[PDB]
């Protein structure tokens, strides 16, 4: 029952095989892209899990014979464009595995696996709303190039990975040599045209295989029950509760507010909690679109209050503390004799007022560390005029916003503190989004609740001259070109404000 479908992808062949391998998986496909081979599978639990949480996991692993954080980064990469495309309220366990059986570094295993994963879900009976595809873009002598080779990347000014579906982009994640907003936005959409071909090719396959999807019947809310709950919510001043300034106190009051409504009033309880969460969600979203005020009283373009300090640790080579609202990071730098530069990120439970077991670095901590390292490596001096190794470790002492971005600001402080002759300071911020069908509002410097109840989390970092790194994921089907362009601009402003503050603290590398 083996079926082979073939095409071209940036000057080398792309083959997708199904029906032969891993047939107990809900769906499974083998991807040959040049000399790169990847087996991708998608499996779902039999019945759906309880509670309001969608367990979705993506793994990636490169076999020893195919030729250690990269695998974790890659798996996080593939999760991003796939996660938002499941019917709302679908809470089956879904696990997606990718095994790189053969790896030609000129033919991206990361991108092969991403398409592999899309295909495996698309042939499966799992109700995924793709296909999706992803692509790598470089930028050499003013020309964009798809899936550049190892040697072209040595020379590109951009290392971008874009992904999305038929009608829109889903995810971007990038590192760059300080390139303009418009250079980036063009790269994005050059990338998306190829994405569109790739999706096209996957749909023909789906049209040929004609898989039978499982039927997800989403329940329709009881108009009347909503109405009752929506009254007990209005009487107890939900609006004013939401507008509590302090993070922990806001969450405490909301919990309590819900904690009371539910006691009115088991399967009926599950509903009331769910109705409550949407009513909270709506209130927050309404306040922003209609009254232009966020739940800590800010306006869509205002950044949180900023504080910073340098040299706070006696014996360390460099040290920086950066505080933006209820998010705070301490970054520490060590120099060494003579991989050459790295940045780690640690997120303790106390940072969010929580108790729990202490572990080895998790997936998220590994992500943010590398994001930080990516944003910064472009401004680190040449080994030729500064022969030392540089390690930076960032500790998140408090968190409500973007620890990862705060750590980039922290680390820039530490680098200057330490007297590292860097190209230019770097700062970063995270952008948010509320869409109403009438229109959208872009939010600057978002807090946790805005990520959680918003539509995107779009992190941009770079210098005054331009962008050094991006990482973006979303919780709606797609982002239009004008929303991306606007976000980049408003993030350019945001970062500029932040570098301005940072230079009050230290205005150049120590001597």
Binding site for its own copies (CB under 8 A): 21-26, 28, 32, 35, 37, 39, 41, 43-45, 57, 59, 63-65, 67, 93-95, 97, 99, 101-102, 104, 247-248, 313-317, 326, 328, 330, 332-334, 348-356, 358, 391, 393, 395, 397-399
* Nearer Cβ to its own copies (59/203): 59
* Nearer Cβ to its own copies (180/316): 316
- DSSP alpha helices (H): ranges in 298-441? 363-377, 403-417
Instruction: Please name which of 350, 337, 451 lies closest in space to residue 396, comparing C-alpha atoms.
Output: 350
Closest separation between CB of residue 59 and its own copies, Å?
6
Strand partners, 319: 332
Closest separation between CB of residue 337 and its own copies, Å?
11
Q: Measure the CA dihedral 149/384/141/13, to 10°.
A: 0
* Nearer Cβ to its own copies (26/110): 26
Distance, CA of 467 to chain centre:
17
Question: Are 498 and 303 contacting, i.e. CB atoms less than 8 angstroms apart?
Answer: yes
* Nearer Cβ to its own copies (287/313): 313
Closest separation between CB of residue 140 and its own copies, Å?
27
Q: How far apart are the first and last CA of the chain?
A: 70
* 457 annotated to bind ligand: yes
DSSP for 131-198 reads --EEEEEEEETTEEEES--HHHHTT-SEEEEEEE-SSSEEEEEEEEEEE-HHHHHHHHHHHHHHHHHH
* Nearer Cβ to its own copies (180/334): 334
Q: How far is CA 165 from CA 128, 250, 342, in A?
A: 12, 37, 34
Instruction: Please name which of 342, 312, 493, 323 lies closest in space to residue 409, comparing C-alpha atoms.
Output: 323
Closest separation between CB of residue 171 and its own copies, Å?
23
* Nearer Cβ to its own copies (101/232): 101
The string over 274-303, giving b where at least 16 C-beta atoms fall within 10 Å of a residue's C-beta and e elsewhere, is ebbeebbeebbbebbeeeeebbbebebeeb
Q: Residue 10 and residue 30: Cα distance in Å, rounded?
A: 19
* Nearer Cβ to its own copies (273/350): 350
Closest separation between CB of residue 191 and its own copies, Å?
27
Closest separation between CB of residue 40 and its own copies, Å?
10
Closest separation between CB of residue 286 and its own copies, Å?
28
* 200 annotated to bind ligand: no
Q: How far is CA 83 from CA 76, 132, 170, 172, 493, in A?
A: 10, 11, 10, 14, 30
Closest separation between CB of residue 302 and its own copies, Å?
21
Closest separation between CB of residue 207 and its own copies, Å?
25
Q: Measure the CA dihedral 351/353/356/362, to 10°.
A: -30
Question: Are 241 and 254 contacting, i.e. CB atoms less than 8 angstroms apart?
Answer: yes
237 sits in the region (left: phi over 0; alpha: psi -120 to 50; else beta) called left
Question: Are 115 and 133 contacting, i.e. CB atoms less than 8 angstroms apart?
Answer: yes
* Nearer Cβ to its own copies (322/440): 322
* Nearer Cβ to its own copies (32/495): 32
* Nearer Cβ to its own copies (20/182): 20
Q: How many CB atoms lie within 10 A of CB 68?
A: 6
* Nearer Cβ to its own copies (21/476): 21
Closest separation between CB of residue 435 and its own copies, Å?
30
Instruction: Please name which of 469, 493, 252 lies closest in space to residue 375, comparing C-alpha atoms.
Output: 469
Closest separation between CB of residue 397 and its own copies, Å?
4
Q: Residue 324 and residue 339: Cα distance in Å, rounded?
A: 30
Question: Are 158 and 187 contacting, i.e. CB atoms less than 8 angstroms apart?
Answer: yes
Angle at 305 between CA 301 and CA 310, to 5 degrees: 130
Binding residues for Mg(2+), as ranges, are: 451, 457
Which residues define the annotated binding site? 451, 457
């Amino acid at each position: 029952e083996k079926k082979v479908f073939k095409t071209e992808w940036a000057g080398r062949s792309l083959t997708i095989e199904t029906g032969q391998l891993a047939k107990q998986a809900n769906g499974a496909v083998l991807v040959r892209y040049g000399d790169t081979v990847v087996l991708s599978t998608a499996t779902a639990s039999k019945e759906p899990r309880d509670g309001d949480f969608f367990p979705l996991t993506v793994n990636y692993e490169e076999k020893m014979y195919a030729a250690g954080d990269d695998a974790t980064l890659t798996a996080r990469l593939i999760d991003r464009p796939i996660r938002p495309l499941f019917p709302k309220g679908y809470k089956h366990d879904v696990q997606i595995m990718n095994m790189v059986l053969s790896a030609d570094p000129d033919c991206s295993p990361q991108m092969a696996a991403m398409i592999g994963s899309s295909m495996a879900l698309s042939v499966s009976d799992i109700p995924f709303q793709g296909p999706i595809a992803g692509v790598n873009v470089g930028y050499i002598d003013g020309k964009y190039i798809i899936n550049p080779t190892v040697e072209e990347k040595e020379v590109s000014r951009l290392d971008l990975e874009v992904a999305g579906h038929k009608d829109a982009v889903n995810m971007v994640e990038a590192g760059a040599s300080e390139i303009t907003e418009q250079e980036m936005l063009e790269a994005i959409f050059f990338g998306h045209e190829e994405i569109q071909r790739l999706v096209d090719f996957q749909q023909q396959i789906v049209d040929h295989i004609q898989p039978v999807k499982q039927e997800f019947i989403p329940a329709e809310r009881d108009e009347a029950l909503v109405e009752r709950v929506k009254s007990l919510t209005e009487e107890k001043g939900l609006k004013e509760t939401v507008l509590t300034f302090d993070k922990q106190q806001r969450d405490e009051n909301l919990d309590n507010l819900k904690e009371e409504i539910v006691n009115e009033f088991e399967l009926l309880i599950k509903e009331v909690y769910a109705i409550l969460n949407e009513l909270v969600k709506e209130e927050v979203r309404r306040l922003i679109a209609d009254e232009k005020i966020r739940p800590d009283g800010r306006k869509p373009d205002e950044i949180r209050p900023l504080d910073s300090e340098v040299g706070i640790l006696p014996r360390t080579h460099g040290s920086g503390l950066f505080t933006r609202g209820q998010t705070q990071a301490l970054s520490v730098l060590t120099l060494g004799a003579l991989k050459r530069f790295m940045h780690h990120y640690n997120f303790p439970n106390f940072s969010v007022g929580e108790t729990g077991p202490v572990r080895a670095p998790g997936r998220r901590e590994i992500g943010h560390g590398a994001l930080g390292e990516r944003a910064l490596k472009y401004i680190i001096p040449d080994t030729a005029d500064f022969p030392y190794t540089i390690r930076i470790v960032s500790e998140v002492l408090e968190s409500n916003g973007s620890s990862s971005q705060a750590s980039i600001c922290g680390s820039t402080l530490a680098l200057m503190d330490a007297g590292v002759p860097i190209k230019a300071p770097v700062a970063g911020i995270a952008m948010g989004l509320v869409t109403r069908e009438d229109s959208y509002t872009i939010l600057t410097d978002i807090q946790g609740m805005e990520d959680a109840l918003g539509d995107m989390d779009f992190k941009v970092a770079g210098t005054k001259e331009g962008i050094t790194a991006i990482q973006m994921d979303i919780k709606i089907d797609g982002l239009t070109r004008e929303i991306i362009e606007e976000a980049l601009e408003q993030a350019r402003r945001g970062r500029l404000e932040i570098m301005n503050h940072m230079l009050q603290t230290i205005d150049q590398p120590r001597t």
